[PDB]
Design a protein around this nucleic acid. Structure first.
Ligand SMILES: [K+]
Length: 140
DNA sequence: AAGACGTGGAC
DNA sequence: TGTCCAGTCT
C-alpha cells in the first residue's frame, strides 16, 4: 500500500515511506505554523537523516535549530528520546512512543499503514486528506 | 487534569 | 511594538 497524493499537499504525503521522518514532521508541527516549521524540518532531516543518527545527537544542538520555532527545549529533548524508543522499543503503533499522541498516530495510521478507514482525525489538514480519501478510494 | 513548553508572523 | 496563536507532556 502506498497513500495517494492529494490536492492539499500535506508533508505526510512525501514522508510516508519512512515512518520515522513522518513522525518527526508531525512533532515539528506541534503547536507550530507550517509556514515556519517546514523549512526547519528539511534542514533537520539533512543533519539528522535517520533514527540511528538522531538518538545520538546532543539535544543542545537540536535546540539551536528549534529556537526560533518556540517549544525548542522540551521538543529537542523529546526528539532525541522519541528516536531512541523508535528504534530500541518494540511497538505496533507510535502512540506507544514518547512525544507522539493522537495526531502523530493518526498520521501514521493513514500514511505508513493501510488503516485510513479506521482513523478518526481531529486535525484540520488530516481531516481534509481523510475526507478526500473517503470520497475517492473507489476511483483510486 | 491543568498548566506548561515558545518563537516570530499577522495584524 | 502588544496580543494572539500555530500537541503532548507532567
Ligand atoms: K505517547
Amino acid at each position: 500500500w502506498t497513500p495517494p497524493r492529494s490536492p492539499f499537499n500535506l508533508v505526510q504525503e512525501t514522508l510516508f515511506h519512512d515512518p520515522w521522518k513522518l513522525l518527526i514532521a508531525t512533532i515539528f508541527l506541534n503547536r507550530t505554523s507550517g509556514k515556519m516549521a517546514i523549512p526547519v524540518l528539511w534542514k533537520f532531516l539533512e543533519k539528522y537523516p535517520s533514527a540511528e543518527v538522531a538518538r545520538t545527537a546532543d539535544w543542545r544542538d537540536v535546540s539551536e535549530l528549534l529556537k526560533p520555532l518556540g517549544l525548542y527545549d522540551l521538543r529537542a529533548k523529546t526528539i532525541v528520546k522519541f528516536s531512541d524508543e523508535y528504534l530500541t522499543k518494540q511497538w505496533k503503533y507510535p502512540i506507544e512512543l514518547h512525544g507522539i499522541g493522537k495526531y502523530g498516530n493518526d498520521s501514521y495510521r493513514i500514511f505508513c499503514v493501510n488503516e485510513w478507514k479506521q482513523v478518526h482525525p481531529e486535525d484540520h489538514k488530516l481531516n481534509k486528506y481523510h475526507d478526500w480519501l473517503w470520497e475517492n478510494h473507489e476511483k483510486l
